[PDB]
Coordinates of N, CA and C and ligand atoms in Angstrom, one line a residue:
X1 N 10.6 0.2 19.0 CA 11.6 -0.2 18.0 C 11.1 -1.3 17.1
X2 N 11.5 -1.2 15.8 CA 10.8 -2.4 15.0 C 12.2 -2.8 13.8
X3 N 12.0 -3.5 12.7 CA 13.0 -4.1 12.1 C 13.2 -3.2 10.6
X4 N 12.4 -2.9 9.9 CA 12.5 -1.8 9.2 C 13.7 -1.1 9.3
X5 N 14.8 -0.9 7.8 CA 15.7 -0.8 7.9 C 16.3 0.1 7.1
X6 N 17.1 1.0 6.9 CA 17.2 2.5 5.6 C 16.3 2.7 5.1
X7 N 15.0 2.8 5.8 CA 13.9 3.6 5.6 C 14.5 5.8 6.1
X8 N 14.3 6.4 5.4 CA 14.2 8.0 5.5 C 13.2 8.2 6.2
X9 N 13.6 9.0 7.1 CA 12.2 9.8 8.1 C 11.6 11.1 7.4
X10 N 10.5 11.2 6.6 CA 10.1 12.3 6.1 C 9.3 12.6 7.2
X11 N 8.3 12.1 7.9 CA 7.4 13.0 9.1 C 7.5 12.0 10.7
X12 N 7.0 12.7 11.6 CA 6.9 11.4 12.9 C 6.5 10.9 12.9
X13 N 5.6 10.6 11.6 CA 4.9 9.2 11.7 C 5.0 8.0 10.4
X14 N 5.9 8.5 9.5 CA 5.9 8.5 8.0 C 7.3 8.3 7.6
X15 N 7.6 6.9 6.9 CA 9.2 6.9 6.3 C 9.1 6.4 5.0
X16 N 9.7 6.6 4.0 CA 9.9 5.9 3.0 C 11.3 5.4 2.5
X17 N 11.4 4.3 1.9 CA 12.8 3.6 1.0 C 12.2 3.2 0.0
X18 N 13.4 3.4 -1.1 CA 13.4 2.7 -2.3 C 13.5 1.0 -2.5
X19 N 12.5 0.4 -2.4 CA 12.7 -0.9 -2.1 C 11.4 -1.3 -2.7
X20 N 11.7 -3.1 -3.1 CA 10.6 -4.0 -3.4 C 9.7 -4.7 -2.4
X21 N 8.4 -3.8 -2.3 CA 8.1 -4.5 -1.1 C 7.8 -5.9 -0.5
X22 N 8.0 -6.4 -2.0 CA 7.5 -7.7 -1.7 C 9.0 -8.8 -0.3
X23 N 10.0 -7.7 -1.0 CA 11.3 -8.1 -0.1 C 11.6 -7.5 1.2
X24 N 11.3 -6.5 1.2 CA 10.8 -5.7 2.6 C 9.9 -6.8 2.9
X25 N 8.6 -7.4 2.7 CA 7.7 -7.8 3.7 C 8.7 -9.6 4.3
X26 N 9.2 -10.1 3.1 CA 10.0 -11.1 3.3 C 11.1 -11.2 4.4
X27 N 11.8 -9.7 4.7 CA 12.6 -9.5 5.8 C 12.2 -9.2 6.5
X28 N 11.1 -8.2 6.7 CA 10.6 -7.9 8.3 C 9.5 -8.9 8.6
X29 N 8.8 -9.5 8.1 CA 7.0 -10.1 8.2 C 6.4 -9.0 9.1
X30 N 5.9 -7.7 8.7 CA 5.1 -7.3 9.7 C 4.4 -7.4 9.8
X31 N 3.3 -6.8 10.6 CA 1.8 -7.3 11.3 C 1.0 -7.1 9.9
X32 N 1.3 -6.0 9.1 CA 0.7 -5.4 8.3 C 1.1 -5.1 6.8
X33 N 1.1 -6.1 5.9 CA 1.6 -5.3 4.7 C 0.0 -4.8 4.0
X34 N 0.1 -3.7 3.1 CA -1.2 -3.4 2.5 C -0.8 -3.5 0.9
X35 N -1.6 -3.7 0.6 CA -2.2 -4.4 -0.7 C -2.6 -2.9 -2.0
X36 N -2.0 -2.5 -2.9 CA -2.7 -2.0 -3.8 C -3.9 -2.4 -4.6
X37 N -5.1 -2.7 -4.1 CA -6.1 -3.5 -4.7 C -6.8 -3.1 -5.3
X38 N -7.6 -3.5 -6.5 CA -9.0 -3.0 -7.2 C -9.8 -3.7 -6.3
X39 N -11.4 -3.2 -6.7 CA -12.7 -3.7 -5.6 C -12.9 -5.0 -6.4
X40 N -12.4 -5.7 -7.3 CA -12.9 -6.9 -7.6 C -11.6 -7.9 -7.0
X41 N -10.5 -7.3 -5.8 CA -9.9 -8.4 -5.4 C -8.6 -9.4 -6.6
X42 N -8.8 -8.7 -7.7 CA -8.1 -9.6 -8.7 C -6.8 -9.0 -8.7
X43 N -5.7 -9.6 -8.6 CA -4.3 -8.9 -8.3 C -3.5 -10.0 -9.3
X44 N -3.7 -8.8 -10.8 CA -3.4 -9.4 -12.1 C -1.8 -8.8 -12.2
X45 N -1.4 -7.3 -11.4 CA -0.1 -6.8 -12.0 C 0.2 -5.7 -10.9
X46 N 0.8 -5.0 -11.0 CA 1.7 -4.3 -9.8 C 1.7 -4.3 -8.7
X47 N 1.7 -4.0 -7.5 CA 1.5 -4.5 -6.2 C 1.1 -5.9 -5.9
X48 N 0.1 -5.9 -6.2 CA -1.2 -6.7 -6.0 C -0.2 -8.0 -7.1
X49 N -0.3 -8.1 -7.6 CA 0.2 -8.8 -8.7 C 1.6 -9.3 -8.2
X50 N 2.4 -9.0 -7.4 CA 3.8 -9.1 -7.6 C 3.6 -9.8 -5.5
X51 N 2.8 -9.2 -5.1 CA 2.6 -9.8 -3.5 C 1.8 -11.4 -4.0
X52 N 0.7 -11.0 -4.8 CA 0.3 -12.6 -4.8 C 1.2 -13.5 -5.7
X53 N 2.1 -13.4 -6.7 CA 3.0 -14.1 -7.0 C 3.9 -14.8 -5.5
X54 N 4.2 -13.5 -4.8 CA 5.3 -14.3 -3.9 C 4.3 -14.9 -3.3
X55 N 2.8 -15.2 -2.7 CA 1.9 -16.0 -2.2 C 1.8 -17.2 -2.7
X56 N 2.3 -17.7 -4.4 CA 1.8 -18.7 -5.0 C 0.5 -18.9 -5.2
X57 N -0.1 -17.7 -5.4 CA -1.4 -17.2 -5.6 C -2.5 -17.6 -4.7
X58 N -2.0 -18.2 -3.4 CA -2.7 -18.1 -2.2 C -3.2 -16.9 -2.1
X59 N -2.7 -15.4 -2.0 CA -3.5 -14.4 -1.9 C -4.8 -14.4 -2.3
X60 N -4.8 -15.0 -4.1 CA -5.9 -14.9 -5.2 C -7.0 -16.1 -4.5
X61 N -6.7 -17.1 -4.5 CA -7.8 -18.1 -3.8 C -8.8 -17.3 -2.6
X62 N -7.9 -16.8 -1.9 CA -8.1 -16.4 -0.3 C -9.3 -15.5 -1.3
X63 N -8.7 -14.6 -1.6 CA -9.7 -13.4 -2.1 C -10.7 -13.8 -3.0
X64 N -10.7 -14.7 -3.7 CA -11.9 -15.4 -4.7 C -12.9 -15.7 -3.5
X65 N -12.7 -16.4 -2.5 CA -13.7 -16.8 -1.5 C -14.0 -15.6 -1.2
X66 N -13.5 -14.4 -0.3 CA -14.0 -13.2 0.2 C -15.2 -12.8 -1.0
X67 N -14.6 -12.4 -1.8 CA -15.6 -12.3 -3.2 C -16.8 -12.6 -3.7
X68 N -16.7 -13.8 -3.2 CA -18.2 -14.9 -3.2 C -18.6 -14.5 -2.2
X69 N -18.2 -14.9 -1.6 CA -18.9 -14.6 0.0 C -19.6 -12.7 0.0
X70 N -18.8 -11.6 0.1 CA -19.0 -10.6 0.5 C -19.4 -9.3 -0.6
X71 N -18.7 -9.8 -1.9 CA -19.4 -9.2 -3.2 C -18.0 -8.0 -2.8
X72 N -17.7 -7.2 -4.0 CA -16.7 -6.4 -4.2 C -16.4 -5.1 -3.0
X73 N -15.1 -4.8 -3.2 CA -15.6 -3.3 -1.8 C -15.6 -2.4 -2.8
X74 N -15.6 -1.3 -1.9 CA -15.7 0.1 -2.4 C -14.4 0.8 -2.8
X75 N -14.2 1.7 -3.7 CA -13.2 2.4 -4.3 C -13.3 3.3 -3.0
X76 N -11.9 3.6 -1.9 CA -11.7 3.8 -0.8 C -11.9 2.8 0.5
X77 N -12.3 1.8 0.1 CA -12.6 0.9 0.8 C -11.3 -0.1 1.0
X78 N -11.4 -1.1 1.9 CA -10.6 -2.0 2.5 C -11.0 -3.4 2.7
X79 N -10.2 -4.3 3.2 CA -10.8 -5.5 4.1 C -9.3 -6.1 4.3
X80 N -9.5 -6.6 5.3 CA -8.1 -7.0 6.1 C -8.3 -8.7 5.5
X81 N -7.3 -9.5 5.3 CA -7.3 -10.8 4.7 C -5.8 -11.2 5.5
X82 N -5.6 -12.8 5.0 CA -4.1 -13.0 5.6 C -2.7 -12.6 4.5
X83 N -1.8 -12.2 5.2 CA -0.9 -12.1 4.6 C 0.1 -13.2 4.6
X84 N -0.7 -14.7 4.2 CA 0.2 -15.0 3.8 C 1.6 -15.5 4.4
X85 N 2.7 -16.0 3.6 CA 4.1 -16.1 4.0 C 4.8 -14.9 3.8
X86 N 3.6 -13.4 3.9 CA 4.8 -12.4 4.0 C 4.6 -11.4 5.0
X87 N 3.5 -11.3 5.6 CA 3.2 -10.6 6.7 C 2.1 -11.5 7.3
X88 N 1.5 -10.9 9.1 CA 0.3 -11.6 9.2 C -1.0 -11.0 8.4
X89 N -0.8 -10.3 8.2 CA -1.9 -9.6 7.6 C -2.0 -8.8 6.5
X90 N -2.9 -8.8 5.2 CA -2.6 -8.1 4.2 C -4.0 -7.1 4.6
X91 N -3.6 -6.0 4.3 CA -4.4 -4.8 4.5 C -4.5 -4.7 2.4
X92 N -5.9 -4.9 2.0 CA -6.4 -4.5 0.8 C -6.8 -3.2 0.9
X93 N -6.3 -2.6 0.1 CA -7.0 -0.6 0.5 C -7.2 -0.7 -1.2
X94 N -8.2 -0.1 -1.6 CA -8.5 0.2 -3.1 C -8.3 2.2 -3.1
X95 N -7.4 2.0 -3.5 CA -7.3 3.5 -3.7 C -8.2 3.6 -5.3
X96 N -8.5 5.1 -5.7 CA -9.1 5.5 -7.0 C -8.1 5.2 -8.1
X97 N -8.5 4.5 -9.3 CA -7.6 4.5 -10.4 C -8.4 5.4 -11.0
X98 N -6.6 6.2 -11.5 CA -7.7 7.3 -12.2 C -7.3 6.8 -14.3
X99 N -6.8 5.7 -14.2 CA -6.7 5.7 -15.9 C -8.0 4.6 -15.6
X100 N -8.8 4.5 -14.9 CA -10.5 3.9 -14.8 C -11.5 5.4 -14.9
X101 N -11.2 6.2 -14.9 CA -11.9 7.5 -14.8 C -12.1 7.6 -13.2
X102 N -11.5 7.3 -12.2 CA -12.0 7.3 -10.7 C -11.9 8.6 -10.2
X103 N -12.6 8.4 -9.4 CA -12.3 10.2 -8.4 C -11.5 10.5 -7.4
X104 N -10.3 10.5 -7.6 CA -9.1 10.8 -6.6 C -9.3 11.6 -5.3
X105 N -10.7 12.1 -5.7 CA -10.7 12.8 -4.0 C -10.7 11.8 -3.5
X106 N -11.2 10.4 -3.7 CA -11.3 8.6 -3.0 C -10.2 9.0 -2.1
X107 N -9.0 9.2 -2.6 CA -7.4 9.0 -2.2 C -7.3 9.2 -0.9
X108 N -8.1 10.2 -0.2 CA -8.1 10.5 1.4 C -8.6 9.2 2.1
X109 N -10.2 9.3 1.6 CA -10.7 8.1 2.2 C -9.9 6.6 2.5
X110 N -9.5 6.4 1.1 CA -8.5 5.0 1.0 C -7.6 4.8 1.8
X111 N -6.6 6.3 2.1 CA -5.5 6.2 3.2 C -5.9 6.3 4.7
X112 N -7.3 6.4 5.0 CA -7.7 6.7 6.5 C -8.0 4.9 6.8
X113 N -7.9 4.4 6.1 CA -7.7 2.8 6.7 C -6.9 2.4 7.3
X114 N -5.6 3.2 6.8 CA -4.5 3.3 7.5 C -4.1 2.7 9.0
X115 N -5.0 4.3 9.5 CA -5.6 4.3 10.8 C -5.7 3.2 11.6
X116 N -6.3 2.2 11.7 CA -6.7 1.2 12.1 C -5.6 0.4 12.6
X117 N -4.6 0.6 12.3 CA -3.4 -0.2 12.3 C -2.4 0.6 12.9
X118 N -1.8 0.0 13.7 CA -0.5 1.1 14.4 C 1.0 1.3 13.7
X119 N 1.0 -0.3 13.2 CA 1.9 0.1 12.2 C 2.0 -0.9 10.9
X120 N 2.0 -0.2 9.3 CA 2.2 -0.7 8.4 C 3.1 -0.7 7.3
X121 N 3.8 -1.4 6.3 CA 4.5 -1.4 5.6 C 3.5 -1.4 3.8
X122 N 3.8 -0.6 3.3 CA 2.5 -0.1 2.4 C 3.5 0.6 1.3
X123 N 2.8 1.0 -0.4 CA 2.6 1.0 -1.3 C 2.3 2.6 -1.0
X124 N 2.6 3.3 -2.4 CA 2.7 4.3 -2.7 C 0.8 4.5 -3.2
X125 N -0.3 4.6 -2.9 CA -1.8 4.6 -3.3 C -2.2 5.8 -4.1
X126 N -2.2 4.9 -5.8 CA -2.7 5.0 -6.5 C -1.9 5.6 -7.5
X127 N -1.1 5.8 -7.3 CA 0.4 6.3 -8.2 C 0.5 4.8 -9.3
X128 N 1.5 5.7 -10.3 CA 2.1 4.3 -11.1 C 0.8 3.7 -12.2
X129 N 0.9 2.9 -11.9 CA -0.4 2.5 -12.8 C -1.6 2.6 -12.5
X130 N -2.0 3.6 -11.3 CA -3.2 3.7 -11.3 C -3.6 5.4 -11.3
X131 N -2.5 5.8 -11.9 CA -3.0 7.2 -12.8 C -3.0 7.9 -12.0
X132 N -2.7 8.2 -10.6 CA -2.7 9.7 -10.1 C -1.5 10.0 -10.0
X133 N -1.2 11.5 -9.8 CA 0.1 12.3 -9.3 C 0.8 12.0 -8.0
X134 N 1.8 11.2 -8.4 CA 2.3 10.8 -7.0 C 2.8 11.2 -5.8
X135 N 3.4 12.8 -6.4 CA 4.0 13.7 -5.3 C 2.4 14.3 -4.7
X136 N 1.3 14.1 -5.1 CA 0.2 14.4 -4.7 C -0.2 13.6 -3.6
X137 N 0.2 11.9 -4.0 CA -0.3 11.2 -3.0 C 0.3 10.8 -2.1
X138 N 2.1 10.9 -2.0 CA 2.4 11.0 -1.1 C 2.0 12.5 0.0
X139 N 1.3 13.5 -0.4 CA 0.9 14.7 0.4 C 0.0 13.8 1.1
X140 N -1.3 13.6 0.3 CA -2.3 12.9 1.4 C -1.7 11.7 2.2
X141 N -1.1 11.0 2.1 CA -0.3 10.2 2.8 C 0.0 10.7 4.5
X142 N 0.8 11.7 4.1 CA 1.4 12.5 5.6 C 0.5 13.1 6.2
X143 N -0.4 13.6 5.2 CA -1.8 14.8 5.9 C -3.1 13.7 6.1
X144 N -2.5 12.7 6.3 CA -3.7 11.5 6.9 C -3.6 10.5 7.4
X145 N -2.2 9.9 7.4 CA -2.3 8.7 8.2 C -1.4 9.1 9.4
X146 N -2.3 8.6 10.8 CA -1.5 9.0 12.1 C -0.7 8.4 12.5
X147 N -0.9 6.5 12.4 CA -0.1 5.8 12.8 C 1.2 5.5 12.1
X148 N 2.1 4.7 12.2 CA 3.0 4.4 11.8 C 3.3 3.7 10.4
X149 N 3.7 4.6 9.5 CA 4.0 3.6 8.3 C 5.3 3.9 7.4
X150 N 5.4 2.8 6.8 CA 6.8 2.5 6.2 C 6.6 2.6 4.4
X151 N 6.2 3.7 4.1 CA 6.6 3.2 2.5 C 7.4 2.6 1.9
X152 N 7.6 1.9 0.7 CA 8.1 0.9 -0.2 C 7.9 1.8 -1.6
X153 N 8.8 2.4 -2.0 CA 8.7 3.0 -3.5 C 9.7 2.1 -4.3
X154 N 9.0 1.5 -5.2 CA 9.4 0.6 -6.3 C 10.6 1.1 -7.2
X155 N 9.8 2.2 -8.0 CA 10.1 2.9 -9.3 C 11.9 3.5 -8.7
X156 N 13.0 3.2 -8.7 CA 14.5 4.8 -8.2 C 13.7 5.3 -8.4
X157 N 13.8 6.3 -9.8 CA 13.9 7.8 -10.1 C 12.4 8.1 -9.3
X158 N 11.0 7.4 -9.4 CA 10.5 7.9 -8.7 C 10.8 8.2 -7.1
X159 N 11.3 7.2 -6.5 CA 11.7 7.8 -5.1 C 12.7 9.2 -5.0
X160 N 13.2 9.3 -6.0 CA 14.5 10.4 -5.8 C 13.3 11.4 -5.9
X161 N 12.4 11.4 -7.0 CA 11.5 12.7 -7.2 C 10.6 13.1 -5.9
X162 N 10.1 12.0 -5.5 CA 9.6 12.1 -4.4 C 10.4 13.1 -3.2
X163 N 11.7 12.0 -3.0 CA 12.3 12.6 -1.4 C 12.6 14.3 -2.2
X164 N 13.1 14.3 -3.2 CA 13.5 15.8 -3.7 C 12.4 16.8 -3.9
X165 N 11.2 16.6 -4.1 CA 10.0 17.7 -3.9 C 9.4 17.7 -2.5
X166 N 9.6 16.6 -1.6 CA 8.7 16.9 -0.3 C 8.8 17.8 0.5
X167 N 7.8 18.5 0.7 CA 7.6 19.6 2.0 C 7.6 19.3 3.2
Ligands
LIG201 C1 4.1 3.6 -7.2 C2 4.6 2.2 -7.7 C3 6.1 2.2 -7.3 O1 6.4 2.1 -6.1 O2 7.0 2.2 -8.2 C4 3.9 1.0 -7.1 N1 4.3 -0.2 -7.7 C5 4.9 -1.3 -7.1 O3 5.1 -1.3 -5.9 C6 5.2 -2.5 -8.0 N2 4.7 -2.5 -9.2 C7 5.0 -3.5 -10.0 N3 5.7 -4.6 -9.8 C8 6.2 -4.6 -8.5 N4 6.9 -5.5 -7.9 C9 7.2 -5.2 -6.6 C10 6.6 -4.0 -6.3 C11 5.9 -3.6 -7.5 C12 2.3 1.1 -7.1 C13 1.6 1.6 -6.1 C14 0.2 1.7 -6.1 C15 -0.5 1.2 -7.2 C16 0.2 0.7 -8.3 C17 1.6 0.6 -8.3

């Protein structure tokens, strides 16, 4: 049992609500929020942008040091950092942007980070402003992550499109 709350059960492992996750992470604090990140760590606007706002841009410091220190990750890549006053942990996943020209096959790899975690409160990866087909990425979503997660769809009308096309 966990705190997560009018979240929709689309699979047994997989729920989504129409919600801000930044407010989601503020009412539950789970172990796990994840991060829509680029590999350079800079979280100028959407996800990334709107979680380190509610950080007071503690997220951005944290990750300037990682950066120095460890040099950029990889497009499907990750790195666990703190979350902050919103969760204990912010899970960075860099899914493929594809209005960067990136290669969306990435999108599997990016979600098998997932994994590692039993349960997370997470972002729709790579949708929205980062140019792929959403009803796509919610597919790899369910057809890849085993443990427990809670999506946060921002956009209504995108959530309505979503719950109304899923298989
Ligand atoms: C799909 C899309 C959405 O769910 O609509 C999502 N965007 C956000 O979650 C978002 N965007 C901008 N400002 C925000 N403030 C609070 C949340 C938030 C998103 C997911 C991956 C990559 C980029 C964008």
């Amino acid at each position: 049992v966990n705190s997560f709350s009018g979240y929709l059960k689309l699979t047994d492992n997989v729920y989504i609500k129409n919600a801000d996750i930044v407010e989601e992470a503020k009412k539950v604090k789970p172990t796990v929020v994840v991060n829509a990140a680029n590999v350079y760590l800079k979280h100028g606007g959407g996800v990334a942008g709107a979680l380190n706002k509610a950080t007071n841009n503690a997220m951005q410091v944290e990750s300037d040091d990682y950066i120095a220190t460890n040099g950029p990750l990889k497009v499907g890549g990750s790195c666990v950092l703190s979350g902050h006053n919103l969760a204990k942990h912010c899970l960075h996943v860099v899914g493929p942007n594809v209005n960067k020209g990136e290669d969306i096959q990435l999108l599997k790899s990016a979600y098998e980070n997932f994994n590692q975690h039993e349960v997370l409160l997470a972002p729709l990866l790579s949708a929205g402003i980062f140019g792929a087909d959403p009803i796509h990425s919610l597919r790899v979503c369910v057809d890849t992550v085993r443990t427990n997660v809670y999506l946060a769809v921002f956009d209504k009308n995108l959530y309505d499109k979503l719950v109304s096309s899923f298989l």
